[PDB]
């Protein structure tokens, strides 16, 4: 007949009960600030259709971040702007401070609050079991917030989590892939970065929800506690699912596709194979045992599940025993 419909177990109808003003980002009126208020200092990085710069707001001598967008698609820019304005002030959500335009090049730029990112490659060795529990909890505060506001981030990964370790400040950045959750809507599966992509995306199941973010979060936690970057190392989108199946096993994959009447792409036939369900304890080694505990393993087991409906919600995750040591 076709695939079985699905819906989020929490915050299902938050957008349904809100005016069109909230979620109709295409109708949203954007108002430009003064580009001249900002002096570009240095290039921070380069994205798909963006160039990120450290800058100074010369009207208050304050450091800011300017993300210049290659205006490839207007609807996309408007969606990012609306979502950022809706979530502004939310816990651990990057604060959009201004929106500016370069008249000569005819290029939009989003201006954010500055975050001093502490070096990731130097964090990895010194970091403790407590530090992982603490920053995991800070990310879930950002997720429970944006999901309660009817938004899925759809690009949760270490590059999109900024940390100022000195001040124990975390921010969830780059809301360029984020979308308003409407029950029953069929979304584009070309979202998230390969390693972080949930099985729903890999099997082309379009009626996904907030729970997509909880899978990406589980990939990050597995990678941190096991010191294995990335945890699921696919070489392409079909291989990515094969890497998951090498961990979760192929039996539960068939239970997932059957439950939702998903048509597996024929490209999966020769590469899928047969895989047994692995124990999480098998990934424990001398290099990572100080970060691993039974609470961490029970928590991870509750996030990394094929069935999107069966994953912990951000709020259920915050109530898990893994976070009993955090405030
Ligand atoms: C003084 N003014 C400096 C200056 C010029 C141009 C831009 C700009 C704005 C949008 C897109 C690309 C560049 C900025 Cl942020 C600052
Ligand atoms: C734009 C830009 O400069 N990005 C830099 C990305 C910086 N990433 C560093 C980092 C460090 C720790 C974690 C983490 C993960 C799981 C639990 C606890 C902490 C994550 Cl997700 C990311
Ligand atoms: C602070 C900061 C740095 C880089 C970025 O790309 C963003 C963002 O996308 O929101 C934010």
UniProtKB/Swiss-Prot annotation:
It is found in: Nucleus. Residues 35-40 are annotated as: Interaction with beta subunit. GO terms for biological process: apoptotic process; chaperone-mediated protein folding; DNA damage response; double-strand break repair; negative regulation of apoptotic signaling pathway; negative regulation of double-strand break repair via homologous recombination; negative regulation of proteasomal ubiquitin-dependent protein catabolic process; negative regulation of signal transduction by p53 class mediator. ATP binds at residues 44-52, 67. Phosphorylation does not directly affect casein kinase 2 activity, but may contribute to its regulation by forming binding sites for interacting proteins and/or targeting it to different compartments. It is an enzyme of class 2 (transferase). Constitutively active protein kinase whose activity is not directly affected by phosphorylation. Seems to be regulated by level of expression and localization. Expressed in gastric carcinoma tissue and the expression gradually increases with the progression of the carcinoma (at protein level). Its main location: nucleus. The active site is at 155 (proton acceptor). Catalytic subunit of a constitutively active serine/threonine-protein kinase complex that phosphorylates a large number of substrates containing acidic residues C-terminal to the phosphorylated serine or threonine. Regulates numerous cellular processes, such as cell cycle progression, apoptosis and transcription, as well as viral infection. May act as a regulatory node which integrates and coordinates numerous signals leading to an appropriate cellular response. Belongs to the protein kinase superfamily. Ser/Thr protein kinase family. CK2 subfamily. It is linked to Okur-Chung neurodevelopmental syndrome: An autosomal dominant neurodevelopmental disorder characterized by developmental delay, intellectual disability, behavioral problems, hypotonia, speech problems, microcephaly, pachygyria and variable dysmorphic features. Heterotetramer composed of two catalytic subunits (alpha chain and/or alpha' chain) and two regulatory subunits (beta chains). The tetramer can exist as a combination of 2 alpha/2 beta, 2 alpha'/2 beta or 1 alpha/1 alpha'/2 beta subunits. Also part of a CK2-SPT16-SSRP1 complex composed of SSRP1, SUPT16H, CSNK2A1, CSNK2A2 and CSNK2B, which forms following UV irradiation. Interacts with RNPS1. Interacts with SNAI1. Interacts with PML (isoform PML-12). Interacts with CCAR2. Interacts with HIRIP3. This is Casein kinase II subunit alpha. The gene is CSNK2A1. The chain holds residues 2 to 328 of 391 of the full protein.
């Amino acid at each position: 007949s076709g695939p079985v419909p699905s819906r989020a177990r929490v915050y299902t109808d938050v957008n349904t009960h809100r005016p069109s003003e909230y979620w109709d980002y295409e109708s949203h009126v954007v108002e430009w600030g003064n580009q001249d208020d900002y002096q570009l200092v240095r290039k921070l990085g380069r994205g798909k259709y963006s160039e990120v710069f450290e800058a100074i707001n010369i009207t208050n001598n304050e450091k800011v971040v300017v993300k210049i967008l290659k205006p490839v698609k207007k609807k996309k820019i408007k969606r990012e702007i609306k979502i950022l304005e809706n979530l502004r002030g939310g816990p651990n959500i990057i604060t959009l401070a201004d929106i500016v335009k370069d008249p000569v090049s005819r290029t939009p730029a989003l201006v954010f609050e500055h975050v001093n990112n502490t070096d990731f490659k130097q964090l990895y060795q010194t970091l403790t079991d407590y530090d992982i529990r603490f920053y995991m909890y800070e990310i879930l505060k950002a997720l429970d917030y944006c999901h309660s506001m009817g938004i899925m981030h759809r690009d949760v990964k270490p590059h999109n989590v900024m940390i100022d370790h000195e001040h124990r400040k975390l921010r969830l950045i780059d809301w360029g892939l984020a979308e308003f959750y409407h029950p029953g809507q069929e979304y584009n599966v070309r979202v998230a970065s390969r390693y972080f992509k949930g099985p729903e995306l890999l099997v082309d199941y379009q009626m996904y929800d907030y729970s997509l973010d909880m899978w990406s979060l589980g990939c990050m936690l597995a990678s941190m506690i096991f010191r294995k970057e990335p945890f699921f190392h696919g070489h392409d989108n079909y291989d990515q699912l094969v890497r998951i199946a090498k961990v979760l096993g192929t039996e539960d994959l068939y239970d997932y596709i059957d439950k939702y009447n998903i048509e597996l792409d024929p490209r999966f036939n020769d590469i899928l194979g047969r895989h047994s369900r692995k124990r999480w304890e098998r990934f424990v080694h001398s290099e990572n045992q100080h970060l691993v505990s039974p609470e961490a393993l029970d928590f991870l087991d509750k996030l990394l599940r094929y069935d999107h409906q069966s994953r912990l919600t951000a709020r259920e995750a915050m109530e898990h025993p893994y976070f009993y040591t955090v405030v």
